[model samples]
Target: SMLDDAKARLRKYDIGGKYSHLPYNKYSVLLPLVAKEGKLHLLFTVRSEKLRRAPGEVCFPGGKRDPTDMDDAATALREAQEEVGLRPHQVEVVCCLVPCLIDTDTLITPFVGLIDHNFQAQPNPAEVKDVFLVPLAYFLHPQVHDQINHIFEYTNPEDGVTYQIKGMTANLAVLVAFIILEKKPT
Candidate 1:
């Protein structure tokens, strides 16, 4: 039942096999989501400390696309399978998000993938330091949002104040997760 409705949303746009429109290098990451007992959980990977790039930082499972790779989605799916032992058939591509310019001079595209529920996980030790599941529903409640002491806010009756707070926190991450997940196919 979920499959039909989810796939139907794909009709909202002209889905393509590949994505590459950046001046720099192209990369893809799979925002894989797992389900169990009718609740959704987000998958995160801690980069291995041996690696030079952002080691020990929390991120999603992903990698650079092989030249022979069929498409951007394939790159994400391939990485997810290799790093987490998820078979190709077990992955369900919900949508491919817009490519954004990241800090590493690589324009990365995030592919939203929904894995089959109750599937067991198997992570590659060489690539991932740790793999964990976080209940997405928990953060949906604003009551659990992260508090920022550095953020100062005052009621400006005449002027509007815009503050740009950067960093990975519960609120920002959860909001980002929702934005990626809520993207309409285009």
Candidate 2:
């Protein structure tokens, strides 16, 4: 499967070298799964509006690194367990992708992982609003391949003044690129 193959590719690369030159912000990505009707479904979360970064955005369950985590993969798993009720033992670490440098100066390392379909997720209300799944087939659909537009709003943290800035979503591009390069021919 493309997911498994992608995971293998990610594992071959070293996590540290990917972001060693960047500023000190770290994060991870969770590839959640559930088995329904004998097929695997992928899960993602819509973040709560109260958070500091990427509020109300559709994202994989993950967060910034902690000093205690042994490595980037560990950080990813730990954050997923905190954000959603994912157990570290239930997740199989497949591989880590190149770090995504956010405009906020955060370097996020997205780990593609696998889990059994029977796992239940209990999302943290403080950070997540809802959990949803899209079939793996949707990820491979040609019609779904497109870049996400990110419209940024400038704000004065000390005051109330705000203005709009331009931004674009890179995850869509990243996923599309992965599909084009890795997906098997129909």
Candidate 3:
């Protein structure tokens, strides 16, 4: 299964670092849609350009943890509801990937979830501009996988501390998982 393969690959990397202890506990949910056409699509929300952070960028529906939420998963679901009007009852969580630290210095835990083809999504005006889906098959292609890259930048803030940002383009592990699932035996 894709989830099993993803887990195995994630274990090979050393994800530990000081940034993992950041105060802000943010969670994001990746709702993978399997359309009636028998194709898989990854749903994403484009944040409004007016926002201060990650404006006009493609992202999952998520935010900082609310005090009422029980855990990271709960926070992800609640944020999904707020950002995209995704009801809790409509989603079936398939698995969770490793937690990643964002360039914004936030600890983000991304969850992979599944839903029916008929599920409806309503975008919140304040946070989301539009919601779209990218076919999972496209993401899983070998050609597409090789396109992933990392961008590094250094910025000196007024505080006198220079911050280095390591930004990664698509999640390679996810793509690998998809390939393992779809690959046919020779």
Candidate 3 weakest ten by summed lDDT: 160-169
Residue-level lDDT of model 1, residues 29-108, one tens digit each, is: 87676765665666777778988887766677778988777878888888888888888888888777556566778777
TM-score of 1: 0.70
**Which stretches of model 2 miss by more than 4 angstroms?**
1-23, 33-40, 142-186
- The TM-score of candidate 3 is 0.67
- Please report how far candidate 2 places residue 133 from its true position, in Å: 0.9
Worst lDDT window (10 residues) for model 2?
Answer: 161-170
By lDDT rank, best first, the candidates go: 1, 2, 3
- Tens-digit lDDT track of model 3 for 59-160: 677777777977677777888888888887777665456677666766676666666556778999899987766555554442321226643222223344
Alpha carbon lDDT of residue 97, candidate 1? 58
Which residue pairs clash within candidate 3?
A: none
Candidates in order, TM-scores: namely 0.70, 0.69, 0.67
Error of 1 at 159 (Å): 47
